[PDB]
Design a protein around this ligand. Structure first.
Ligand SMILES: *[C@@H]1O[C@H](CO[C@@H]2O[C@@H](C)[C@@H](O)[C@@H](O)[C@@H]2O)[C@@H](O[C@@H]2O[C@H](CO)[C@@H](O[C@@H]3O[C@H](CO[C@H]4O[C@H](CO)[C@@H](O)[C@H](O)[C@@H]4O[C@@H]4O[C@H](CO)[C@@H](O[C@@H]5O[C@H](CO)[C@H](O)[C@H](O)[C@H]5O)[C@H](O)[C@H]4NC(C)=O)[C@@H](O)[C@H](O[C@H]4O[C@H](CO)[C@@H](O)[C@H](O)[C@@H]4O[C@@H]4O[C@H](CO)[C@@H](O)[C@H](O)[C@H]4NC(C)=O)[C@@H]3O)[C@H](O)[C@H]2NC(C)=O)[C@H](O)[C@H]1NC(C)=O
Ligand SMILES: *[C@@H]1O[C@H](CO[C@@H]2O[C@@H](C)[C@@H](O)[C@@H](O)[C@@H]2O)[C@@H](O[C@@H]2O[C@H](CO)[C@@H](O[C@@H]3O[C@H](CO[C@H]4O[C@H](CO)[C@@H](O)[C@H](O)[C@@H]4O[C@@H]4O[C@H](CO)[C@@H](O[C@@H]5O[C@H](CO)[C@H](O)[C@H](O)[C@H]5O)[C@H](O)[C@H]4NC(C)=O)[C@@H](O)[C@H](O[C@H]4O[C@H](CO)[C@@H](O)[C@H](O)[C@@H]4O[C@@H]4O[C@H](CO)[C@@H](O)[C@H](O)[C@H]4NC(C)=O)[C@@H]3O)[C@H](O)[C@H]2NC(C)=O)[C@H](O)[C@H]1NC(C)=O
Lengths: 210, 208
């Protein structure tokens, strides 16, 4: 016992922002029983049925239920224009098909402002210091943030989740931890942001000892 | 059917004697057919019965959200005692146990750093005052802002984030009219955490 359940996952924020990448919506059905293992997917874009999804064969799990995945490739401009993607899942153990819908959050997009903040005077008594990137005033909350210096990725960073601000836009901070020496030697560090409301879906802000 | 969820105290409440920390047992999706709920509470095994149940708010789906509330001792929670909630029903095949306690591990003191607005931002009507709090453990923490002894309220604080060393960090953003910052007012980020001496510290921020 335990009827099937459906989870619908959006594309990754970077994937809709760059045409070289492949944005996808993923419809996952879990807890499919052995007695009723047949699963049917119907896909709709703004209520209109589409037939180009790629559905995988069911995969039995170690708890003896089946998991079935259907992947719908989306056009970047369709996602950014706010189309609604509906996954309809039909199983003979279900009273009625299960429907899940996903889209970009509704609202007018807002351009992020990106500000770099150097380490506090207090922190420069430690061996590692904190380079901060503040990204505020953006909408919707889908965004990507990265760090680099001299063209190469800096991996020792963490980014807060987006946070709803009091004007209804979002903000976040990204913290990059570097060895104090590197900051003191005047290296330039770069915070880069990918968001739909930026020109070319991209901006960069630099930060160095001055 | 009914679902049962247990919630911990607010961090501020466990850190100040004058505040009242509580654990909270909430029950969703309870029907009129079967809307009668019971509660038992236990603390580190040793049962207690100084709890208190509340009014079963009916919700917009013919279900009755029910809630019990157990008051807890500050140092019991900070010493890691477990708090178990058992809700006996009759539409229940069996009773449902649910337990909660403070995150395990050596507490670590937050470092607090204030950062002033970026130069680029100073062309706006309002500016962002930043408070970085890092290196703390557990993630239970409270952050406030004030100026001239009075609370600043137009601020937002990120959730704690797991850092690479296993400690947590967060950021708090206070937004002020740029004129206030230009005048030279002093703004204060205050941080409450169990690993702080007297559970409290302040860092101040002014135009300099
Ligand atoms: C039997 O086993 C199965 C299988 O489990 C496996 O086998 C067993 C035996 C064990 O070994 C087990 O450890 C194994 O994992 C069990 O199946 C599980 O069933 C549960 C439900 O019971 C599912 O729980 C939901 O998980 C969601 C998150 O799933 C992702 O994250 C977890 C890790 O955190 C992964 O394990 C998952 O696979 C998912 O991973 C995501 O997968 C996507 C699809 O591939 C990825 O997206 C794609 O990725 C590519 C790559 O880049 C491209 O980018 C594509 O473009 C992109 O589409 C995605 O990146 C990937 N992420 C990660 C991190 O890996 C939760 O979302 C979900 O929560 C919702 O539902 C809850 C109610 O059930 C609710 O409480 C939650 O709040 C939430 O509700 C939603 O909330 C959000 C906001 O918070 C709202 O937006 C929604 O509206 C709201 N919906 C509501 C309210 O309805 C669940 O927690 C679990 O995922 C599933 N596992 C697997 C592997 O599928 C099964 O339970 C067992 N049965 C029994 C009886 O025991
Ligand atoms: C019928 O309606 C009801 C009511 O909803 C309302 O009515 C409908 C009609 C709509 O109008 C709707 O919009 C309305 O909201 C529906 O009710 C919901 O039912 C779901 C269950 O299906 C419940 O979802 C769980 O939520 C838990 C968190 O709840 C808090 O947060 C939400 C917001 O996110 C609030 O809505 C809640 O009220 C809770 O808010 C917290 O409340 C506490 C109690 O008061 C507060 O603490 C106290 O506060 C006081 C004063 O404020 C003192 O300070 C005390 O000191 C303090 O203790 C607290 O502050 C407050 N916080 C916030 C932020 O508001 C989730 O915990 C839970 O998730 C777990 O379980 C999931 C299973 O679904 C699982 O998927 C999750 O991943 C997660 O699993 C856990 O994971 C962690 C690790 O991450 C592990 O530790 C656990 O082991 C693991 N547990 C597992 C796996 O089991 C659920 O998501 C929801 O509570 C409830 N809504 C309400 C409002 O109560 C109902 O669904 C409808 N029915 C139908 C059939 O449609």
């Amino acid at each position: 016992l335990g009827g099937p359940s459906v989870f619908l996952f959006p594309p990754k924020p970077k994937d809709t922002l760059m045409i070289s990448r492949t944005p996808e919506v993923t419809c996952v059905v879990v807890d499919v029983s052995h007695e009723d293992p047949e699963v049917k997917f119907n896909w709709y874009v703004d209520g209109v049925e589409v037939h180009n999804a790629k559905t995988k064969p069911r995969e039995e799990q170690y708890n003896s239920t089946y998991r079935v995945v259907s992947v719908l490739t989306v056009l970047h401009q369709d996602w950014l224009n706010g189309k609604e993607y509906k996954c309809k899942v039909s199983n003979k153990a279900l009273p009625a098909p299960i429907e899940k819908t996903i889209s970009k959050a509704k609202g007018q997009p807002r351009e992020p402002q990106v500000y770099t903040l150097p380490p506090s005077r207090d922190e420069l008594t430690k061996n590692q210091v904190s380079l901060t990137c503040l990204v505020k005033g953006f909408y919707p909350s889908d965004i990507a943030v990265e760090w680099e210096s001299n063209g190469q990725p800096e991996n020792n960073y963490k980014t807060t989740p987006p946070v709803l601000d009091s004007d209804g836009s979002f903000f976040l901070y990204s913290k990059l931890t570097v060895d104090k020496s590197r900051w003191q030697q005047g290296n330039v560090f770069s915070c880069s942001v990918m968001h739909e409301a930026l020109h070319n879906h991209y901006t960069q802000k630099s930060l160095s000892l001055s």
